[PDB]
Coordinates of all heavy atoms in Angstrom, one line a residue:
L182 N -12.3 17.6 12.8 CA -11.5 18.3 13.8 C -11.6 19.8 13.6 O -11.5 20.6 14.6 CB -10.0 17.8 13.7 CG -9.6 16.5 14.3 CD1 -10.3 15.3 13.6 CD2 -8.1 16.4 14.2
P188 N -12.2 25.0 21.6 CA -10.9 25.6 21.4 C -9.9 25.2 22.4 O -8.7 25.7 22.4 CB -11.2 27.1 21.5 CG -12.2 27.2 22.6 CD -13.1 25.9 22.5
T192 N -7.8 20.1 21.3 CA -7.7 20.1 19.9 C -6.3 19.7 19.4 O -6.2 18.7 18.6 CB -8.0 21.5 19.4 OG1 -7.2 22.5 20.1 CG2 -9.5 21.9 19.6
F196 N -5.4 16.7 16.9 CA -4.6 16.8 15.7 C -3.3 15.9 15.8 O -2.9 15.3 14.9 CB -4.2 18.2 15.4 CG -5.4 19.1 15.0 CD1 -6.4 19.5 15.9 CD2 -5.5 19.5 13.6 CE1 -7.4 20.2 15.5 CE2 -6.6 20.3 13.2 CZ -7.5 20.6 14.2
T269 N -0.9 22.5 9.3 CA -1.5 23.7 9.0 C -2.8 23.9 9.6 O -3.2 25.0 10.0 CB -1.5 23.9 7.5 OG1 -2.3 22.8 6.9 CG2 -0.1 23.9 6.9
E270 N -3.6 22.8 9.6 CA -5.0 22.9 10.2 C -4.8 23.1 11.7 O -5.7 23.8 12.3 CB -5.8 21.6 9.9 CG -6.2 21.6 8.4 CD -7.2 22.7 8.1 OE1 -8.2 22.8 8.8 OE2 -7.0 23.4 7.1
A271 N -3.8 22.4 12.3 CA -3.6 22.6 13.8 C -3.2 24.0 14.1 O -3.7 24.7 15.0 CB -2.6 21.6 14.3
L272 N -2.2 24.6 13.4 CA -1.8 25.9 13.6 C -2.9 26.9 13.4 O -3.0 27.9 14.1 CB -0.6 26.2 12.7 CG 0.2 27.6 12.9 CD1 0.8 27.5 14.3 CD2 1.2 27.8 11.8
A273 N -3.7 26.7 12.4 CA -4.8 27.6 12.1 C -5.9 27.5 13.2 O -6.4 28.6 13.6 CB -5.5 27.3 10.7
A274 N -6.2 26.3 13.7 CA -7.1 26.2 14.8 C -6.6 26.8 16.0 O -7.3 27.5 16.8 CB -7.5 24.7 15.0
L275 N -5.3 26.7 16.3 CA -4.6 27.3 17.4 C -4.6 28.8 17.3 O -4.9 29.5 18.3 CB -3.2 26.8 17.6 CG -2.8 26.0 18.8 CD1 -1.4 25.6 18.8 CD2 -3.2 26.8 20.1
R276 N -4.3 29.3 16.1 CA -4.3 30.8 15.9 C -5.7 31.4 16.0 O -5.9 32.5 16.4 CB -3.6 31.1 14.6 CG -4.4 32.1 13.7 CD -3.5 32.7 12.6 NE -2.9 31.7 11.8 CZ -3.6 31.1 10.7 NH1 -4.8 31.5 10.5 NH2 -3.0 30.2 10.0
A277 N -6.7 30.6 15.6 CA -8.1 31.1 15.6 C -8.6 31.4 17.0 O -8.7 32.6 17.4 CB -9.0 30.1 14.9
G278 N -9.0 30.4 17.7 CA -9.6 30.5 19.0 C -8.7 31.2 20.0 O -9.1 32.2 20.5
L279 N -7.6 30.6 20.3 CA -6.7 31.1 21.3 C -6.0 32.5 20.8 O -5.6 32.6 19.7 CB -5.6 30.2 21.7 CG -5.8 29.2 22.8 CD1 -4.6 28.4 23.2 CD2 -6.3 30.0 24.0

Side-chain angles (χ1 to χ4, degrees):
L182 281 64
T192 50
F196 290 73
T269 57
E270 289 295 309
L272 188 66
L275 244 181
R276 134 163 57 81
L279 267 189

